[PDB]
Amino acid sequence: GAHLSSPLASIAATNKLCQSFQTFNICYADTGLLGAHFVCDHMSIDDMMFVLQGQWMRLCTSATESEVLRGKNLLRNALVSHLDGTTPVCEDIGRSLLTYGRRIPLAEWESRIAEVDARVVREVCSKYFYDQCPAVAGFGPIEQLPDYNRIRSGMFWLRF
Amino acid sequence: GRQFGHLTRVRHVITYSLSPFEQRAFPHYFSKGIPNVLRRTRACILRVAPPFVAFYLVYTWGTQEFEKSKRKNPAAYENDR
């Protein structure tokens, strides 16, 4: 419903600005991909966006350690969660080997979790978000979707 | 009505563009542009100038026509009588 903690899941259920969306991460060998994928009404497109830039941008500055925790716990859960079952256990190794080698730094991941900090996330996101050049993919009936030049100016806040 | 939403209906068009940073403010603006200036300038100058001629002609035509008509009183009637 509308009482969820995620501002998006709060608004996107509230005014149903989208049908649904989810965010992805894909990190290649040398590369990584951060962004979301959403579906919204042909008249509802803009408003999804002007929201979505809100969240990333506000993180880079005004974020807070409280909400860090609720994020922190989840990822611990999701981490521990996926680890059940023969195949997934089996499956980590292969990529991990091809990725980090043997490393299955299981308990370390936890230690790794303890590393993250408020400044960290801000300082990290400051790099990879604030004033950057985003990529835009689209599939019709797009037309509402604003021109790039908006999105671009829309990446960096003016402080508002 | 709502300006961007409902205007037309269009399908199976595709569009490609880049960040403005990715590219240059003057991709051969001088060299490549100058011909484009020239080629189209004639399509107009065909249909542009011809009247401008006419005035300037008449302008001077009347000017002279005006001058001697006025300028010289003892022109046709000279001052013998």
B36 domain residue, yes or no: yes
Domain that holds residue B67: 2-75
B60 domain residue, yes or no: yes
Domain that holds residue A75: 1-156
B21 domain residue, yes or no: yes
Q: Which residues of A touch B3 (CB under 8 A)?
A: none
User: Rounded to an integer, what distance in angstroms lies between the CA atom of residue A132 and that of residue A154?
Assistant: 10
B3 touches chain A (CB under 8 A): no
B14 touches chain A (CB under 8 A): no
Choose among A52, A60, A105, A58: nearest CA to A83: A105
According to the entry, how was the structure determined?
Answer: cryo-EM
B80 domain residue, yes or no: no
CB contact under 8 A, B10 and A143: yes
Q: At what angle do helices A118-128 and A65-82 cross, to 10 degrees?
A: 80
CB contact under 8 A, A133 and B22: yes
Per DSSP, the residues of chain A read ----SSHHHHHHHHT--SSEEEEEEEE-SS-EEEEEEEE--TTTHHHHHHHHHHHHHHHHHH--HHHHHHHHHHHHHHHHHHT-SHHHHHHHHHHHHHHHTT---HHHHHHHHHH--HHHHHHHHHHHTSS--------SS-TTSPPHHHHHHHHS-S--
- What's phi and psi for A86, nearest 5 deg? -60, -65
Domain of B39, CATH number, reads: 1.20.5.210
A149 touches chain B (CB under 8 A): yes
Domain of A69, CATH number, reads: 3.30.830.10
Q: Which candidate from B2, B5, B21 shows the least CB-CB separation from A133? A: B21
How many separate domains does chain A show? 1
Whether A30 contacts A39, CB under 8 Å: no
B81 domain residue, yes or no: no
Q: Which residues of A touch B7 (CB under 8 A)?
A: 143
How many separate domains does chain B show? 1
Specify the resolution in Å: 5.0
